[PDB]
């Protein structure tokens, strides 16, 4: 679970959204008259009508994650 | 769970949103007459109509996360 | 759970929002006549119509998090 | 749970919001005639119509967090 | 739970809000005829129509937090 | 779970969205009169009408993840 | 232009209005940088959101009117 | 132009209106940079969102009108 | 222009109005930088959000009017 | 132009309106940079979203009108 | 132009309207950069989304009208 | 132009409308850069999404009209 990014030194980014009656549901748990429900979310969740990820790593960049589930 | 980012040294970013009746639900638990529900969220959740992540790492950048679930 | 970021030295950022009847629900637990509900949230949750994260790491930057759940 | 950020040395940021009947609910627990509910929130939650996070780390910056749940 | 940030040395930030009938609810617990409810909040929660966090770390900056729950 | 990216040194990005009655559901669990449901999500999930990932790695960039499930 | 109504002898009326931002313009003359305008109105004009005319003639009733325009 | 109504002798009326942003324009003359306009109205004009005319003649009732235009 | 009504002999009326930001303009002449305007009104004009005319003629009733315009 | 109605003697009326952003324009003259316009209206004009005319003649009822236009 | 209706003597009426963004234009004259326009209307014009005319003549009822146009 | 209706003596009417973005244009004259237009309307014009005419003549009822156009 180690992330390293070292940088040694010796544009137009447009997002245009025009929505009418836009409904966004991310991590959602909807139920009625149920018994049990498990919602295990361990990561980076992006949800939406205009989901833009521009130039996420431009220089030295390190991305890491770790999830698990132990029930025995 | 270690993050390191060292930087040694020796633009236009536009977001335009125009929404009409925009409904955003992030981490939501909706129920009626239910018995049990588990909502385990351990990460960075982005939810919405105009979800823009521009130039998230520009220089030296380190991103890390760690989730788990132990019930035995 | 260690974050380190060292920097040694030897633009226009616009967000425009125009919403009509905008409803945002973040971490929400809505119920009626239910018995039990668990809402375990341990991370950085961003929820909304104009959710903009511009230049989150520009220089030396370190991001980390750690979540868990022990019930035995 | 250690955060370190050392910096050694030897723009226009606009947010424009125009909302009509804007309703924002953050960490909310709404119920009627229920028995038990648990709302465990341990992280930095951002909720709203114009949620802007610009230049969060510009120089040397360290971000960390730690959550848990023990019931046995 | 240690935060350190040392800095050794040897722009226009605009927020514009124009809201009509804006309702903001932060950490809220609304109930009627219920039995028990637990609202455990241990982190920095930002809730609102114009939620702007500009230049949160500009120089040397250290952010940390720690939450927990023990019931046995 | 180690990510490393080191960089040593010695354009127009447009997204245009115009949606009418756009409904986005990300990680969603919808049920009625059910008994048990498991929703195990450990990765970076992108969901939406205009899902754009431009120039995700531009310089030195490292991406990693790790998921698991133990029930015994 | 003669009206006569002679009567020889030998209930619940509900109006319910609930308006939000109701704008009513009756006989209106709106102009800018114009030269000439003629507004000749000679009759009974009813204008409005809840325009109710219940039981206008219940017994002996006589209604008459007369308009004209002479310019030669 | 004679109206006569003679009567010799020897219920629930509900109107329910619930409007949101209701705009009513009756006899209206809107112009800009025009030269001449004639608005000749000689009759009973009813204009509106809830225009109800219930039981206008219940007993002996006489309705009459007369309009004209002479220019030669 | 003669009105006659002779009567020889030998209920609940409810109006309910609940308005928010209600604007009523009756006989109105609005102008800017204009030259000439004529507003000739000779009749009974009723203008408004809750314009109710209940039981206008109940017994012997006579209504009459007369308008004209001579310019030669 | 004579109306006569003589009567010799020897229920639930519901209107329900629920409108959202309802715009009603009756007798309207809209122009820009025009030269001449004639609007000759001599009759009973009913204009609107919920235009109800119930039981207009119930007993003895007489309706008449007369219009004309002379220009020579 | 004579109307006569004599009557000698010896139910549920429901209208339900539920509109969203309802636009009604009755007698309308819309122009730009035009020269001349004639709008001659002499009759009873009913215009709208829910235009209901129930039981217009129930007893003795007389309806008449007369229009013309002379230009020579 | 004579109407007569004499009556000598010796149910559920439902209209249900549910419209979304309903646009009704009755007698309309729309033009741009035109020279001349004539709109001669002399009759009873009914225009709309839910145009219902139920039981227009139930008892003794007389309907008449007369139009013309003289230009020579």
DSSP J1-62: -EEE--EEE--EEEEEEEEES-EEE-SEEE-SS-SEEEEEE-S--EESSEEE--SSBSSSEE
- 3-state secondary structure at position G58: coil
Binding site membership of A for Cu cation: which residues? 25
State the Cα–Cα distance between residues J37 and J28, nearest whole angstrom. Answer: 12
Chains that touch I (3 or more CB pairs under 8 A): G, H
Measured in angstroms, the resolution is 4.2
State the Cα–Cα distance between residues K50 and A16, nearest whole angstrom. Answer: 39
Residue E44 marked ligand-binding: no
J53 and G54 in contact (C-beta within 8 Å)?
no
3-state DSSP helix/strand/coil percent for chain D, to nearest 5? 0, 50, 50
- 3-state secondary structure at position K51: strand
State the Cα–Cα distance between residues B20 and D19, nearest whole angstrom. Answer: 10
Q: How many angstroms separate the Cα of I71 from the Cα of each of B13, G12, G70, G71, H70?
A: 67, 49, 6, 5, 11
I25 and H27 in contact (C-beta within 8 Å)?
no
Residue B41, chain F, CB below 8 Å: the answer is: no
- 3-state secondary structure at position G24: strand
State the Cα–Cα distance between residues A52 and E20, nearest whole angstrom. Answer: 29
Residues near C44 by beta carbon (within 8 Å), at least 6 away in sequence? B44, C65, D43, D44, D45, D46, D65
Q: How many angstroms separate the Cα of K64 from the Cα of each of B9, H61, H64, K2, K59?
A: 94, 15, 10, 7, 16
Give which of H61, L19, H70 is closest to K70, Cα–Cα. H70
Q: How many angstroms separate the Cα of B48 from the Cα of each of F9, G19, H70?
A: 38, 32, 65
Residue numbers in D near E5 (CB within 8 A): 3-6, 60, 62
Exposure on the CB side of residue B39, measured as CA atoms within 13 A: 32
CB contact under 8 A, H25 and G20: no
Cβ-Cβ contacts under 8 Å between A and F: the total is 290
Query: In what helix (H) or strand (E) does residue G43 lie, and over which residues does it extend?
Result: none
Number of Cβ atoms within 10 Å of the Cβ of I8: 11
Burial environment of residue H56 by CB neighbours within 10 A (0 to 12, 13 to 18, 19 or more): buried
Interface test with K, best of L8, L36, L62 (most K CBs within 10 A): L62
Record the tokens describing residue A57, joined without a space: 């790593």
Longest CA pairwise span in chain H (Å): 65
G61 and H5 in contact (C-beta within 8 Å)?
yes
C42 and B43 in contact (C-beta within 8 Å)?
no
Would residue E24 be called left, alpha or beta, if left means φ above 0 and alpha means ψ between -120 and 50 degrees? beta
Strand ranges (DSSP E) for C1-72?
2-4, 7-9, 12-20, 23-25, 28-30, 38-41, 46-47, 50-52, 61-63
F35 and B35 in contact (C-beta within 8 Å)?
no
State the Cα–Cα distance between residues H39 and H29, nearest whole angstrom. Answer: 8
J28 and H41 in contact (C-beta within 8 Å)?
no
Record the tokens describing residue J24, joined without a space: 């009603």
CA torsion, ordered C6, C7, C11, C16, to nearest 10 deg: 10
Q: Do chains E and A touch (3 or more CB pairs under 8 A)?
A: no
State the Cα–Cα distance between residues H61 and G5, nearest whole angstrom. Answer: 8
Residues near D23 by beta carbon (within 8 Å), at least 6 away in sequence? C22, C23, C24, E22, E23
Strand ranges (DSSP E) for chain I?
2-4, 7-9, 12-20, 23-25, 28-30, 36-41, 46-47, 50-52, 61-63
- Which residue(s) pair with K50 in the sheet? J50, L50
Chains that touch H (3 or more CB pairs under 8 A): G, I, J, K
The length of chain C is 72
Give which of D5, D23, D66 is closest to B61, Cα–Cα. D5
List gaps in chain D by the residue before each (C–N > 2.5 Å): 10
State the Cα–Cα distance between residues K15 and G19, nearest whole angstrom. Answer: 19
Residue C26, chain E, CB below 8 Å: the answer is: yes
Residue H33 phi/psi, 5° resolution? 60, 35
Give which of E37, K9, G42 is closest to C29, Cα–Cα. E37
Longest CA pairwise span in chain I (Å): 65
Residue numbers in H near K42 (CB within 8 A): 67
Residues near A15 by beta carbon (within 8 Å), at least 6 away in sequence? A50, A52, A54, B14, B15, B16, B50, B52, B54, F15
State the Cα–Cα distance between residues L61 and L6, nearest whole angstrom. Answer: 8
- Which residue(s) pair with A50 in the sheet? B50, F50
Cβ-Cβ contacts under 8 Å between C and E: the total is 4
Give which of C43, G15, K32 is closest to D42, Cα–Cα. C43
State the Cα–Cα distance between residues G50 and I14, nearest whole angstrom. Answer: 14
Question: Token pair 């998090």 is at which residue?
Answer: C65
Beta H61-63 vs F61-63: how paired, if at all? Answer: unpaired
Give which of E67, E48, E70, E52 is closest to E14, Cα–Cα. E52
Residues near C24 by beta carbon (within 8 Å), at least 6 away in sequence? B24, B26, B48, C47, C48, C49, D22, D23, D24, D25, D47, D48, D49
Instruction: Output DSSP code: residue L66.
Output: -
- Helices H, strands E: what count in chain G? 0, 9
First to last CA, chain C: 23
D41 and E40 in contact (C-beta within 8 Å)?
yes
Residues near D1 by beta carbon (within 8 Å), at least 6 away in sequence? C1, D64, D66, E1, E2, E64, E66
State the Cα–Cα distance between residues G14 and J56, nearest whole angstrom. Answer: 18
Interface test with B, best of D16, D43, D44 (most B CBs within 10 A): D43
Record the tokens describing residue C34, joined without a space: 């239910």
Give which of H70, L69, H2 is closest to K67, Cα–Cα. L69
Instruction: Output DSSP code: residue D35.
Output: S
Record the tokens describing residue F8, joined without a space: 């040593």
Question: Token pair 């408004």 is at which residue?
Answer: I48
- Which residue(s) pair with I13 in the sheet? G13
CA angle A51, A56, A62 (to 5 degrees): 135
CB contact under 8 A, A47 and F40: no
Give which of J43, K19, H51 is closest to G48, Cα–Cα. H51
Residues near L45 by beta carbon (within 8 Å), at least 6 away in sequence? K43, K45, K46, K47, L26, L27
Number of Cβ atoms within 10 Å of the Cβ of I35: 12
Number of Cβ atoms within 10 Å of the Cβ of I30: 14
Beta E23-25 vs J23-25: how paired, if at all? Answer: unpaired
Residue numbers in H near I47 (CB within 8 A): 26
Give which of A62, F7, J31 is closest to G34, Cα–Cα. J31
State the Cα–Cα distance between residues B19 and C67, nearest whole angstrom. Answer: 35
CB contact under 8 A, B56 and A59: no
First to last CA, chain K: 23
> How far, rounded to the nearest angstrom, does the alpha carbon of residue C68 sit from its chain's CA centroid?
17
State the Cα–Cα distance between residues F28 and G44, nearest whole angstrom. Answer: 60
C34 and A33 in contact (C-beta within 8 Å)?
no
Residue numbers in D near E19 (CB within 8 A): 17-20, 22
CA torsion, ordered D39, D42, D43, D45, to nearest 10 deg: 30
State the Cα–Cα distance between residues D45 and F67, nearest whole angstrom. Answer: 24
K2 and J56 in contact (C-beta within 8 Å)?
no
- 3-state secondary structure at position E65: coil
Number of Cβ atoms within 10 Å of the Cβ of D9: 14
Number of Cβ atoms within 10 Å of the Cβ of C72: 10
H9 and J9 in contact (C-beta within 8 Å)?
yes
State the Cα–Cα distance between residues F59 and A62, nearest whole angstrom. Answer: 11
State the Cα–Cα distance between residues C14 and F31, nearest whole angstrom. Answer: 41
Burial environment of residue L20 by CB neighbours within 10 A (0 to 12, 13 to 18, 19 or more): exposed
Pure H helices in chain I: none
State the Cα–Cα distance between residues L47 and L39, nearest whole angstrom. Answer: 16
Residue numbers in J near G57 (CB within 8 A): 61
Pure H helices in K1-72: none
3-state DSSP helix/strand/coil percent for chain L, to nearest 5? 0, 50, 50
State the Cα–Cα distance between residues J13 and I12, nearest whole angstrom. Answer: 15
State the Cα–Cα distance between residues L26 and A53, nearest whole angstrom. Answer: 49
Instruction: Output DSSP code: residue A37.
Output: -
CA torsion, ordered L42, L44, L45, L49, to nearest 10 deg: 170
CB contact under 8 A, H14 and G16: yes
Query: In what helix (H) or strand (E) does residue B66 lie, and over which residues does it extend?
Result: none
State the Cα–Cα distance between residues B48 and E23, nearest whole angstrom. Answer: 19
- 3-state secondary structure at position E55: coil
Interface test with G, best of H10, H29, H66 (most G CBs within 10 A): H29
Residues near J54 by beta carbon (within 8 Å), at least 6 away in sequence? H52, H53, H54, H55, J13, J15, K13, K15, K52, K54, K55
Instruction: Output DSSP code: residue D28.
Output: E
DSSP for chain E?
-EEE--EEE--EEEEEEEEES-EEE-SEEE-SS-S--EEEE-S--EESSEEE--SSBSSSEEE------B--
Beta E12-20 vs F12-20: how paired, if at all? Answer: unpaired
Residue F66 phi/psi, 5° resolution? -155, 125
Residue G12 phi/psi, 5° resolution? -105, 125
Question: Token pair 């025995």 is at which residue?
Answer: A72
Query: In what helix (H) or strand (E) does residue D6 lie, and over which residues does it extend?
Result: none
Residue numbers in L near J47 (CB within 8 A): 26
State the Cα–Cα distance between residues F26 and F24, nearest whole angstrom. Answer: 6
Residue B51, chain F, CB below 8 Å: the answer is: yes
- Structure determination technique employed: cryo-EM
Exposure on the CB side of residue I40, measured as CA atoms within 13 A: 20
Record the tokens describing residue F65, joined without a space: 């993840």
Residue F40 phi/psi, 5° resolution? -105, 110
State the Cα–Cα distance between residues B52 and F13, nearest whole angstrom. Answer: 13
State the Cα–Cα distance between residues D52 and C67, nearest whole angstrom. Answer: 25
3-state DSSP helix/strand/coil percent for chain K, to nearest 5? 0, 50, 50
Q: Which residues of D13-35 are buried (b: 16+ CB within 10 A; e: fewer)?
A: bbbbbbbeebbbbbbbbbbeebb
């Amino acid at each position: 679970v180690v992330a390293a990014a070292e940088k040694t030194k010796q544009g137009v980014l447009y997002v245009g959204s025009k929505t009418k009656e836009g409904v966004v549901h991310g991590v959602a748990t909807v139920a009625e008259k149920t018994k049990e429900q498990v919602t295990n979310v361990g990561g980076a969740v992006v949800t939406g009508v205009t989901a833009v990820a521009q130039k996420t790593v431009e220089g030295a960049g390190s991305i890491a994650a770790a999830t698990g589930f132990v029930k025995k």
